[PDB]
Design a protein around this nucleic acid. Structure first.
Lengths: 268, 321
DNA sequence: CACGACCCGCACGTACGCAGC
DNA sequence: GGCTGCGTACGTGCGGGTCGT
């Protein structure tokens, strides 16, 4: 009994705060009140509200078209289920793909996707609703990654939308090359297989190699935290190269156990 | 002074009653007016009327001051917009600065159970799982494009069809959109729930394969269609953690995806690249979901493949073999 | 479709804050 | 300072809602 009175009176207070704040929220939303000299009688405030409201479900399909265009670089298209030929495409195809509609309208979808995707395409056209991922043209060839979302009714209706000097290496605790970037060959003129399967210090300079060893020691010691080390490095032109390598221990997000040392290797 | 008392508050009783009459009859006609059918717009809660009114009006505010009108009358076929609604799979949220959901699409029912009728105008943080409220909060203000995940309430469940608020199961949402401005701004996102592997509601391909891993992305199982696509036998990968195969330029983003997967329930990773048994890599997008008891047990992954294989260039000591 | 369990929303009566002949 | 028209804020009582075992 004596635990409801307070609870309620304060629930009520919450309601008053909330609601009167709703009113003063609506006040500065209807032109007439926001322009008006001072605050009007709540009653008259929302008299004005009704009167303005009538002066206009929630949005028209046109409005929400606009809306979801401003929510995704994307466009609508319709294609016959099992011939591939395009039937409709929204104009938004041009600001998304640079494709004239005279071009895109005639076409078959298969002749608009990435070649090796065509197989995957017909897989998604065999007779509920469907959704998948493909690559598409760009015109004026650099293709673009387009997510696709649609259904079946005869033909298929859907919407496509697009998602918006140095080199990198992975080692284990010993320093053994585990992964090596391809751009490495530009950096030090080496072929990854001439790097994989063996350590890194044998590429460092005789009077620097200790800095390497104990720096790796610190990297694993300094769990997760970054640290850089400068040293000299054998190119395959026999020539030596200075090197700022930034490394840090990767420990698994779940298990926080070592996986590999990630080093971003830069020349200075 | 009872002769005074009788004058004091009788006037107060019936006049305040008169005002209350005015008040009410003035509210339910606002509600009546609403875009909603009189069917429900009529017998509608008091405050919710205010919610919907405010929301509707603000929506038209930002909408109109996206300019996007002066040439509004002519632009596209109207049947195609009818279809524009339906073709999407996920709902649309127009959420303000302080997180007031001034527009949720109708499609929302199909996914969250809850309707826009119940939600339009309410604060987002009421409906979103905490521990996300701050992530969301970041995503709401200050380029302009947004892409993240959030845990929202759901009243449909795995085999249930319908449910009420009390039984709020958490459903994860891939949110992708922009942030338009009209002086203050407004977030505009398409949210799409991640489909569960056992409760698959859509078709896969031979082009799309499936794997199961431990909570540290150490494999447990995977079907044998791997070989045909990228050249690995499933049994070559069991004890192996997933990071040992990831290309480097991605594993940071993959770290993001994994720590999300732990912190939330599911993730959709970016288009990463994975090193084949031999030369080079293949593009890839994985949909990951965690399986509980109750305690976390497993992680299962719906792996979508995108392309063929830098065909020869070697990357790791696995390929060097 | 009962039943206290309640929780919610609702309005009523009223009490403190401001005009003015 | 009287006592009234004019309004927004506080607390309680009554009716129609949904759980739960």
């Amino acid at each position: 009994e004596r635990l409801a009175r307070e609870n309620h009176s304060e629930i009520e207070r919450r309601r008053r705060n909330k609601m009167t704040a709703y009113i003063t929220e609506l006040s500065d939303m209807v032109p007439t009140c926001s322009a008006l000299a001072r605050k009007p009688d709540k009653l008259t405030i929302l008299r004005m509200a009704v009167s303005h409201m009538k002066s206009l479900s929630f949005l028209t399909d046109q409005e929400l078209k606009h809306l979801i265009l401003e929510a995704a670089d994307g466009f609508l298209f319709i294609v016959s289920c099992e011939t591939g030929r395009v039937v409709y495409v929204s104009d938004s195809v041009t600001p998304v793909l640079n494709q004239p509609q005279s071009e895109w309208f005639g076409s078959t979808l298969y002749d608009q996707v990435h070649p090796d995707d065509v197989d995957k395409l017909r897989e998604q056209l065999s007779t509920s609703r469907r959704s998948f991922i493909c690559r598409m043209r760009c015109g004026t060839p650099h293709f673009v990654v387009v997510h696709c979302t649609g259904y079946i009714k005869f033909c298929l209706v859907a919407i496509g939308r697009l998602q918006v000097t140095e080199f990198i290496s992975r080692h284990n605790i010993e320093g053994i090359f585990t992964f090596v970037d391809h751009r490495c060959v530009a950096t030090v003129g080496y072929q990854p297989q001439e790097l994989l399967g063996k350590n890194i210090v044998e590429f460092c300079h005789p009077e620097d190699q200790q800095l390497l060893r104990d720096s790796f020691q610190q990297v694993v010691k300094l769990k997760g935290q970054v640290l850089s080390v400068m040293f000299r490095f054998r190119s395959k032109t026999r020539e030596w190269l200075w090197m700022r390598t930034s490394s840090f221990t990767f420990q698994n997000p779940y298990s926080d156990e070592i996986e590999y040392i990630i080093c971003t290797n830069t020349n200075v | 002074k009872r002769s005074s008392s009788e004058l004091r508050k009788e006037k107060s009783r019936d006049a305040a009653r008169c005002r209350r009459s005015k008040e009410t009859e003035v509210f339910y006609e606002l509600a009546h007016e609403l875009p909603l059918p009189h069917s429900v717009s009529s017998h509608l809660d008091k405050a919710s009327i205010m919610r919907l009114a405010i929301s509707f009006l603000r929506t038209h505010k930002l909408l109109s001051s996206v300019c996007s009108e002066n040439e509004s009358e002519a632009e596209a076929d109207q049947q195609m917009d009818n279809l524009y609604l339906k073709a999407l799979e996920g709902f649309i949220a127009v959420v303000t600065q302080d997180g007031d959901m001034i527009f949720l699409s109708e499609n929302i029912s199909k996914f969250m159970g809850l309707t826009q009728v119940e939600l339009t105008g309410h604060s987002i943080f009421d409906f979103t799982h905490p521990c996300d409220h701050e992530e969301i909060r970041e995503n709401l203000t200050l380029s302009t494009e947004r892409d993240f995940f959030m845990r929202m309430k759901c009243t449909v469940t795995n085999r249930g069809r319908t449910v009420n608020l009390k039984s709020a199961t958490w459903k994860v949402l891939h949110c992708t959109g922009q942030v338009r401005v009209y002086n203050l701004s407004c977030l505009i996102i398409m949210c799409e729930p991640i489909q569960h592997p056992s409760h698959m509601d859509i078709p896969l391909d031979s082009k799309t394969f499936l794997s199961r891993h431990s909570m540290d992305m150490k494999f447990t199982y995977c079907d044998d269609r791997i070989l045909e696509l990228i050249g690995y036998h499933p049994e070559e990968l069991l004890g192996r953690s997933a990071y040992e195969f990831y290309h480097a330029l991605d594993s940071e983003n993959m770290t993001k995806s994994h720590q999300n997967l732990c912190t939330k329930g599911q993730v959709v990773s970016g288009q990463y690249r994975m090193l084949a048994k031999h030369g080079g890599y293949v593009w890839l997008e994985t949909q990951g979901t965690v399986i509980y008891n109750l305690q976390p047990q497993c992680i299962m992954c719906v792996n979508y493949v995108l392309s063929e294989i830098k065909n020869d260039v070697v990357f790791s000591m696995d390929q060097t073999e």
